[PDB]
């Protein structure tokens, strides 16, 4: 009952393959169905064609900016900021799903894919989602990442939505 979505993704517009995600809407209700319609591009806009704008190995990969490309931009589909839903689901490790953000309710469309245990975002950052299928294709994109975030090549999502 949980949405399921999918990203695919390209390289240099080479495509990489597809990773899906496990959005728990069950516990973030909010939080799950604005990645779920920025997937789907249902209200117009959304994540199809941007790009993963910072990759840090060993850390995550964080994308979502579909406005700036670059970390500055991104809304949700509740205007440009929304709340912190809650912090039910906890940062346990590679391919956690959750919000990027700037300080307290400042949810936008942002989001990063975890790569590791990163426990000490917990209660700062929402988790709403995880890897189900994939979880390869998200370590084959941290091998265009570097350490200060800058990509090697360009990682863009090339197609997105909802398989269910």
């Given amino acids: 009952v949980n949405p399921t979505v999918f990203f695919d993704i390209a390289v240099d517009g080479?495509?990489?393959?597809?990773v899906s995600f496990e959005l728990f809407a069950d516990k973030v209700p909010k939080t799950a169905e604005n990645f779920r319609a920025?997937?789907?591009?249902?209200?117009?806009?959304?994540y199809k064609g941007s790009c993963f704008h910072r990759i840090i190995p060993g850390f995550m990969c964080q994308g979502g900016d579909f406005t700036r490309h670059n970390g500055?931009?991104?809304?949700?589909?509740?205007?440009?900021?929304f709340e912190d839903e809650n912090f039910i689901l906890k940062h346990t490790g590679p391919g956690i799903l959750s919000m990027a953000?700037?300080?307290?309710?400042?949810?936008?469309?942002?989001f990063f894919i975890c790569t590791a245990?990163?426990?000490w975002l917990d209660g700062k950052h929402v988790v709403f989602?995880?890897?189900?299928?994939?979880?390869?294709?998200?370590?084959?994109?941290?091998?265009?990442?570097?350490?200060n975030g800058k990509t090697?090549?360009?990682?863009?999502?090339?197609?997105?939505?909802?398989?269910?």
């Fill in 14 to 18: 080479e495509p990489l393959g597809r």
């Fill in 38 to 46: 920025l997937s789907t591009g249902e209200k117009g806009f959304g």
């Fill in 72 to 81: 500055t931009g991104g809304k949700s589909i509740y205007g440009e900021k």
């Fill in 101 to 110: 953000n700037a300080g307290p309710n400042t949810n936008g469309s942002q």
């Fill in 117 to 119: 245990k990163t426990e």
């Fill in 129 to 147: 989602g995880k890897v189900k299928e994939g979880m390869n294709i998200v370590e084959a994109m941290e091998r265009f990442g570097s350490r």
């Fill in 152 to 164: 090697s090549k360009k990682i863009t999502i090339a197609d997105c939505g909802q398989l269910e």
